Amino acid sequence: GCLEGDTHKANPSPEPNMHECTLYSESSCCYANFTEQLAHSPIIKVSNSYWNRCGQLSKSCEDFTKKIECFYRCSPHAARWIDPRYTAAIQSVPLCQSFCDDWYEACKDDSICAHNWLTDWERDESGENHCKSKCVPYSEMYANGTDMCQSMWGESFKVSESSCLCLQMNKKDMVAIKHLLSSEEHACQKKLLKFEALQQ
Ligand SMILES: *[C@@H]1O[C@H](CO)[C@@H](O)[C@H](O)[C@H]1NC(C)=O
Ligand SMILES: *[C@@H]1O[C@H](CO)[C@@H](O)[C@H](O)[C@H]1NC(C)=O
Ligand SMILES: [Cl-]
Ligand SMILES: [Cl-]
DSSP states (O other): OOOOSSSOOOSSOOOOOOSGGGTTSBBBBBBBHHEEEEEESSOEEETTEESSTTTTOOHHHHHHHHHHHHHHHHHHHHGGGEEEEEEEEOOOOOOOOOHHHHHHHHHHTTTTTTSSTTTTTEEESSEEEEEEEOOOOOOOOOHHHHHHHHHHHGGGEEEOSSSSSSSSSSOOOOOHHHHOOOHHHHHHHHHHHHHHHHOO
Protein backbone atom coordinates (compact mmCIF):
# COMPACT_ATOMS: atom_id res chain seq x y z
CA GLY A 1 0.00 0.00 0.00
CA CYS A 2 0.83 3.68 -0.34
CA LEU A 3 -0.08 6.56 1.94
CA GLU A 4 -3.40 8.25 1.10
CA GLY A 5 -1.86 11.67 0.72
CA ASP A 6 -2.27 14.40 -1.89
CA THR A 7 0.16 12.99 -4.48
CA HIS A 8 0.58 9.30 -3.80
CA LYS A 9 -0.16 6.47 -6.18
CA ALA A 10 -2.65 3.77 -5.10
CA ASN A 11 0.05 1.12 -4.86
CA PRO A 12 3.81 1.00 -5.35
CA SER A 13 5.00 0.21 -8.87
CA PRO A 14 8.18 0.77 -10.90
CA GLU A 15 8.70 4.32 -12.10
CA PRO A 16 11.22 4.62 -15.00
CA ASN A 17 11.83 8.35 -15.49
CA MET A 18 12.38 9.70 -12.00
CA HIS A 19 14.43 12.89 -11.80
CA GLU A 20 15.17 12.46 -8.11
CA CYS A 21 14.19 10.03 -5.34
CA THR A 22 15.71 7.30 -7.57
CA LEU A 23 16.40 5.22 -4.50
CA TYR A 24 12.71 4.28 -5.02
CA SER A 25 12.70 3.98 -8.87
CA GLU A 26 11.89 0.27 -9.18
CA SER A 27 9.10 0.46 -6.61
CA SER A 28 7.68 3.92 -5.94
CA CYS A 29 4.62 5.52 -4.34
CA CYS A 30 5.20 8.79 -6.27
CA TYR A 31 4.66 9.53 -9.96
CA ALA A 32 7.80 10.69 -11.73
CA ASN A 33 6.22 14.13 -12.31
CA PHE A 34 6.47 14.85 -8.59
CA THR A 35 10.25 14.45 -8.79
CA GLU A 36 10.73 17.18 -11.45
CA GLN A 37 10.44 19.84 -8.71
CA LEU A 38 13.51 18.48 -6.91
CA ALA A 39 15.81 18.07 -9.94
CA HIS A 40 17.43 21.48 -9.65
CA SER A 41 19.29 23.03 -6.75
CA PRO A 42 18.68 25.46 -5.27
CA ILE A 43 15.22 24.10 -4.50
CA ILE A 44 13.05 27.15 -3.85
CA LYS A 45 9.56 25.72 -3.67
CA VAL A 46 8.07 22.24 -3.53
CA SER A 47 4.35 22.03 -4.12
CA ASN A 48 2.96 25.01 -2.11
CA SER A 49 5.87 25.22 0.32
CA TYR A 50 8.85 27.55 0.12
CA TRP A 51 12.12 25.98 1.32
CA ASN A 52 14.00 29.28 1.47
CA ARG A 53 12.05 31.19 4.13
CA CYS A 54 15.04 31.89 6.35
CA GLY A 55 17.48 31.99 3.44
CA GLN A 56 18.82 29.52 0.95
CA LEU A 57 19.82 26.24 2.53
CA SER A 58 23.36 24.98 2.11
CA LYS A 59 23.56 22.15 -0.41
CA SER A 60 24.10 19.27 2.06
CA CYS A 61 21.28 20.50 4.30
CA GLU A 62 19.05 20.65 1.24
CA ASP A 63 20.12 17.09 0.37
CA PHE A 64 18.95 15.80 3.74
CA THR A 65 15.64 17.67 3.54
CA LYS A 66 15.17 16.23 0.05
CA LYS A 67 15.81 12.66 1.31
CA ILE A 68 12.91 13.00 3.78
CA GLU A 69 10.64 14.51 1.12
CA CYS A 70 11.48 11.56 -1.17
CA PHE A 71 10.79 9.06 1.60
CA TYR A 72 7.38 10.52 2.48
CA ARG A 73 6.33 10.92 -1.13
CA CYS A 74 7.97 7.92 -2.84
CA SER A 75 9.00 5.15 -0.40
CA PRO A 76 7.06 1.97 -1.05
CA HIS A 77 7.29 1.15 2.70
CA ALA A 78 6.31 4.46 4.35
CA ALA A 79 2.68 3.25 4.55
CA ARG A 80 3.79 0.53 6.97
CA TRP A 81 3.95 3.40 9.49
CA ILE A 82 0.58 4.84 8.44
CA ASP A 83 -1.55 6.54 11.08
CA PRO A 84 -4.84 4.66 10.65
CA ARG A 85 -7.00 7.67 11.66
CA TYR A 86 -5.01 10.09 9.45
CA THR A 87 -4.03 8.14 6.33
CA ALA A 88 -1.76 10.85 4.85
CA ALA A 89 0.37 10.86 8.02
CA ILE A 90 3.15 8.58 9.26
CA GLN A 91 4.12 7.83 12.84
CA SER A 92 7.23 6.54 14.58
CA VAL A 93 9.28 5.85 11.49
CA PRO A 94 12.60 4.79 13.07
CA LEU A 95 15.47 6.95 11.83
CA CYS A 96 19.10 6.02 12.43
CA GLN A 97 20.81 8.37 14.86
CA SER A 98 23.89 8.61 12.64
CA PHE A 99 21.56 9.90 9.91
CA CYS A 100 19.98 12.48 12.21
CA ASP A 101 23.40 13.48 13.52
CA ASP A 102 24.89 13.98 10.03
CA TRP A 103 21.81 15.97 9.09
CA TYR A 104 22.09 18.29 12.07
CA GLU A 105 25.76 18.78 11.26
CA ALA A 106 24.88 19.62 7.65
CA CYS A 107 22.23 22.16 8.74
CA LYS A 108 23.77 23.52 11.96
CA ASP A 109 24.62 26.94 10.45
CA ASP A 110 21.57 27.11 8.20
CA SER A 111 18.52 29.00 9.53
CA ILE A 112 14.94 27.91 10.20
CA CYS A 113 11.73 29.35 11.70
CA ALA A 114 9.49 26.28 12.19
CA HIS A 115 10.40 24.00 15.05
CA ASN A 116 7.85 21.63 13.60
CA TRP A 117 8.01 21.96 9.81
CA LEU A 118 4.49 20.63 9.32
CA THR A 119 2.50 22.73 11.80
CA ASP A 120 4.44 25.88 12.76
CA TRP A 121 3.70 28.09 9.72
CA GLU A 122 1.20 30.78 8.81
CA ARG A 123 -0.57 29.43 5.71
CA ASP A 124 -2.05 32.09 3.40
CA GLU A 125 -4.94 32.06 0.89
CA SER A 126 -2.94 30.29 -1.80
CA GLY A 127 -1.62 27.60 0.62
CA GLU A 128 1.87 29.10 0.91
CA ASN A 129 3.91 29.05 4.12
CA HIS A 130 5.12 32.04 6.12
CA CYS A 131 7.27 32.22 9.26
CA LYS A 132 5.56 33.19 12.48
CA SER A 133 8.49 32.49 14.81
CA LYS A 134 11.90 34.12 14.23
CA CYS A 135 14.57 32.72 11.91
CA VAL A 136 17.28 31.07 14.02
CA PRO A 137 20.07 28.63 13.22
CA TYR A 138 19.21 24.93 13.34
CA SER A 139 21.81 24.70 16.14
CA GLU A 140 19.65 27.08 18.16
CA MET A 141 16.32 25.58 17.11
CA TYR A 142 17.34 22.05 18.23
CA ALA A 143 19.93 20.82 20.71
CA ASN A 144 21.19 18.00 18.51
CA GLY A 145 20.33 15.63 15.63
CA THR A 146 18.12 13.49 17.85
CA ASP A 147 16.09 16.45 19.07
CA MET A 148 15.74 17.69 15.47
CA CYS A 149 14.51 14.38 14.06
CA GLN A 150 11.96 13.98 16.83
CA SER A 151 10.71 17.54 16.39
CA MET A 152 10.87 18.40 12.65
CA TRP A 153 7.78 16.34 11.69
CA GLY A 154 6.14 15.76 15.09
CA GLU A 155 5.27 12.09 15.68
CA SER A 156 6.27 11.20 12.09
CA PHE A 157 9.80 10.13 13.03
CA LYS A 158 11.58 8.74 16.08
CA VAL A 159 15.25 7.92 16.61
CA SER A 160 15.86 4.19 17.03
CA GLU A 161 18.11 2.81 19.77
CA SER A 162 19.44 0.44 17.09
CA SER A 163 22.14 1.38 14.58
CA CYS A 164 20.77 -1.29 12.16
CA LEU A 165 16.97 -1.45 12.62
CA CYS A 166 16.56 2.11 11.40
CA LEU A 167 16.24 4.04 8.12
CA GLN A 168 18.86 6.41 6.75
CA MET A 169 17.51 6.98 3.21
CA ASN A 170 20.18 5.07 1.32
CA LYS A 171 20.64 1.46 0.08
CA LYS A 172 21.17 0.15 3.61
CA ASP A 173 17.43 0.64 4.22
CA MET A 174 17.01 -2.60 2.20
CA VAL A 175 18.71 -4.34 5.13
CA ALA A 176 16.76 -2.46 7.78
CA ILE A 177 13.40 -2.94 6.07
CA LYS A 178 13.72 -6.72 6.03
CA HIS A 179 13.85 -6.84 9.85
CA LEU A 180 11.55 -3.93 10.73
CA LEU A 181 8.58 -5.77 9.17
CA SER A 182 17.17 -8.77 20.49
CA SER A 183 17.08 -11.51 17.90
CA GLU A 184 16.08 -9.19 15.07
CA GLU A 185 18.96 -6.91 16.21
CA HIS A 186 21.67 -9.54 15.65
CA ALA A 187 20.07 -10.79 12.46
CA CYS A 188 20.06 -7.23 11.09
CA GLN A 189 23.62 -6.52 12.15
CA LYS A 190 24.92 -9.69 10.41
CA LYS A 191 22.91 -8.95 7.28
CA LEU A 192 24.43 -5.45 7.35
CA LEU A 193 27.96 -6.84 7.54
CA LYS A 194 27.32 -8.89 4.35
CA PHE A 195 25.90 -5.78 2.67
CA GLU A 196 28.98 -3.70 3.46
CA ALA A 197 31.22 -6.51 2.20
CA LEU A 198 29.37 -6.92 -1.11
CA GLN A 199 29.55 -3.20 -1.85
CA GLN A 200 33.34 -3.18 -2.52
C1 LIG B 1 1.17 13.33 -12.38
O1 LIG B 1 0.81 12.25 -13.23
C2 LIG B 1 -0.30 11.51 -12.72
C3 LIG B 1 -0.54 10.28 -13.58
O2 LIG B 1 0.50 10.18 -14.57
C4 LIG B 1 -1.53 12.40 -12.69
O3 LIG B 1 -2.63 11.69 -12.10
C5 LIG B 1 -1.27 13.67 -11.88
O4 LIG B 1 -2.36 14.59 -12.06
C6 LIG B 1 0.03 14.34 -12.32
N1 LIG B 1 0.37 15.42 -11.41
C7 LIG B 1 0.66 16.63 -11.86
C8 LIG B 1 0.95 17.66 -10.80
O5 LIG B 1 0.69 16.90 -13.05
C1 LIG C 1 20.10 15.58 22.69
O1 LIG C 1 19.41 16.73 23.19
C2 LIG C 1 18.35 16.37 24.07
C3 LIG C 1 17.56 17.62 24.44
O2 LIG C 1 18.45 18.63 24.92
C4 LIG C 1 18.92 15.70 25.31
O3 LIG C 1 17.85 15.27 26.16
C5 LIG C 1 19.78 14.49 24.93
O4 LIG C 1 20.48 14.02 26.09
C6 LIG C 1 20.78 14.86 23.84
N1 LIG C 1 21.44 13.66 23.36
C7 LIG C 1 20.76 12.68 22.77
C8 LIG C 1 21.57 11.52 22.29
O5 LIG C 1 19.54 12.72 22.63
CL1 LIG D 1 7.01 9.41 -17.44
CL1 LIG E 1 20.13 10.73 -5.11
